[PDB]
C-alpha cells in the first residue's frame, strides 16, 4: 500500500498527546513560562482540561497557536484563514478537521441496554442477517439505534476529536516560533555554538494494538557546493549541520 515515510500519506497525527523537550537533563525548552502548560507541548486534552482547548475540538490553545505560527506566522495578531497560496496540500490548516458527536450516556440513561450487532434489529425482514446476503426476518419496530433527538432523546455524552492527515507536526527552533529566516535566531545563539548539549525528548501517544514508529525529522542544513575546475572534473563538498555525517 501507500508508504507514508516516502510518499507523505501521513494519517496518524491525531494520536499524539504531548511532547516534552529537555536540554542537558535539566533545562526545559522553550521554558521561559511561554506556554499555558509551560513544561511541555500539549497536543490535546481530554474533557478534564476542556477550558484549555480551542477550535471546537480537543486540540489545545497552545498547540493551535504553535502550529499556526510555524506554518504561517499567524497567531500574535489574531487567527484567520491563511492565504491559499501558503496553505498547500501538506499544510496544517487545509488538513485540519475538528469533529464532534453525541452518544448515549451509558451511566445516566436509566433504560440503557448494551445491545451488540448480533441482537440489533433495524430493517429486519428487509435485510440479510450479519451479511450482505438475501433478505430475511420480518417487519418489526427497530430496537436500535437510540434516539438522540426528539422529545424522547436519551441522556447523552459529547465526544470531540480531530484529524490532521498528510501533514507533519512542527516545532521550530525559533524564539517566537515564527519564520524569520532559514537560519533561525536560536540556531545562531552563542549558547548553542560555544558548546555541546545533550537532548531528551518524551512523547506521549495514544495506544495502538500494533507496532508503530515515531518518525522524527531533525531540521538542518543539508548542502552541497559543486566545483568544476576542468573538463570532465566534478568535485563536491557536502556539509550537513547540525548532525554532520
Amino acid at each position: 500500500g501507500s508508504i507514508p515515510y516516502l510518499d507523505g500519506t501521513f494519517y496518524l497525527n491525531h494520536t499524539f498527546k504531548k511532547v516534552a523537550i529537555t536540554f542537558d537533563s535539566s533545562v526545559s525548552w522553550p521554558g521561559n513560562d511561554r506556554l499555558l502548560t509551560p513544561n511541555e507541548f500539549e497536543i490535546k486534552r481530554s474533557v478534564d482540561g476542556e477550558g484549555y482547548n480551542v477550535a471546537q475540538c480537543n486540540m489545545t490553545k497552545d498547540w493551535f497557536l504553535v502550529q499556526m505560527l510555524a506554518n504561517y506566522n499567524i497567531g500574535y495578531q489574531g487567527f484567520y484563514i491563511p492565504e491559499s497560496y501558503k496553505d498547500r496540500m501538506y499544510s496544517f490548516f487545509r488538513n485540519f478537521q475538528p469533529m464532534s458527536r453525541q452518544v448515549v450516556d451509558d451511566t445516566k440513561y436509566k433504560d440503557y441496554q448494551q445491545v451488540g450487532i448480533l441482537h440489533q434489529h433495524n430493517n429486519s425482514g428487509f435485510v440479510g442477517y450479519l451479511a450482505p446476503t438475501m433478505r430475511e426476518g420480518q417487519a418489526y419496530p427497530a430496537n436500535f439505534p437510540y434516539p438522540l433527538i426528539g422529545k424522547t432523546a436519551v441522556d447523552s455524552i459529547t465526544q470531540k476529536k480531530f484529524l490532521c492527515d498528510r501533514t507533519l507536526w512542527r516545532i521550530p527552533f525559533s524564539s517566537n516560533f515564527m519564520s524569520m529566516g532559514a537560519l533561525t535566531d536560536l540556531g545562531q545563539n552563542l549558547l548553542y555554538a560555544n558548546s555541546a548539549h545533550a537532548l531528551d525528548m518524551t512523547f506521549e501517544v495514544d495506544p495502538m494494538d500494533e507496532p508503530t514508529l515515531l518518525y522524527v525529522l531533525f531540521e538542518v542544513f543539508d548542502v552541497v557546493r559543486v566545483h568544476r575546475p576542468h573538463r570532465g572534473v566534478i568535485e563536491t563538498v557536502y556539509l550537513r549541520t547540525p548532525f554532520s555525517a
Partner: protein, 200 residues
C-alpha cells in the same frame, strides 16, 4: 382491472446511501471486526488478497442509520490508512495509465531526484553516470488493498534502459563564455535538499 394496479415498493435513496457505506467503509473495516465465511475455503495468509476478499463483514456495522446527523469519522477507521482505497484518484489514474489488463508491456520515464545533481548545470566533459533500480514488487508497485504482491503473483521484468538528455542549442561563443565563468570557484553551484533534515 378493478381497483389500483399491482405495485412493489422500494426506497431508492436509502438503498443508494447504504451501498455507498458498505462499499466504501464497511469493507475497509479492520479485520478484527470481520469473520470467516462458512463452507468456504479461505487463505491462511492475511496479507493475501484471497483473505481480504473472503472475510465477511456485517453491513449493520456501517448502516444508513450510523451516527445520523453527524459529521464524524468512524473511530474504527481513524487509524486505518485512508490511502489504501479504490477511491484513491491518484492510484486509480496511475493504474489506468497502464491499462485495464493484467499483462502490461511498459514504457516509462524516470526522473533524477537526488538534490545534489537534479538541477545541476553540467559542463563539458565525459561523465560516468550509474544508478540502481529496485525489482521488488512490494516496492515498485502499489495496490489499493495493500496485499502482498510477492505472494500474490505480481511480476516485473526490465528489458531496456536508456538515458536521455536535451540540450539548449546555445551559441558556441556564448556557451564557451558561460563555461569559463562557471569554472571559477567563486561561481561554484550550490544546492540544498528541500526536506533539509536528518531522519530518525
Amino acid at each position: 382491472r378493478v381497483g389500483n394496479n399491482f405495485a412493489m415498493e422500494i426506497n431508492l435513496n436509502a438503498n443508494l446511501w447504504r451501498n455507498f457505506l458498505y462499499s466504501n467503509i464497511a469493507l475497509y473495516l479492520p479485520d478484527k471486526l470481520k469473520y470467516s465465511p462458512s463452507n468456504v475455503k479461505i487463505s491462511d495468509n492475511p496479507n493475501t488478497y484471497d483473505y481480504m476478499n473472503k472475510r465477511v463483514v456485517a453491513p449493520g456495522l456501517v448502516d444508513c442509520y450510523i451516527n445520523l446527523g453527524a459529521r464524524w469519522s468512524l473511530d474504527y477507521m481513524d487509524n486505518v490508512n485512508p490511502f489504501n482505497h479504490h477511491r484513491n484518484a491518484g492510484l486509480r489514474y496511475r493504474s489506468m495509465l497502464l491499462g485495464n489488463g493484467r499483462y502490461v508491456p511498459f514504457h516509462i520515464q524516470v526522473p533524477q531526484k537526488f538534490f545534489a545533481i537534479k538541477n545541476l548545470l553540467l559542463l563539458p566533459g565525459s561523465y560516468t553516470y550509474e544508478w540502481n533500480f529496485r525489482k521488488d514488487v512490494n516496492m515498485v508497485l502499489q495496490s489499493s488493498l495493500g496485499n502482498d504482491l510477492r505472494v500474490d503473483g505480481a511480476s516485473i521484468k526490465f528489458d531496456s534502459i536508456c538515458l536521455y538528455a536535451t540540450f539548449f542549442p546555445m551559441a558556441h561563443n556564448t556557451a564557451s563564455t558561460l563555461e569559463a565563468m562557471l569554472r571559477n570557484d567563486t561561481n561554484d553551484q550550490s544546492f540544498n535538499d528541500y526536506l533539509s533534515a536528518a531522519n530518525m
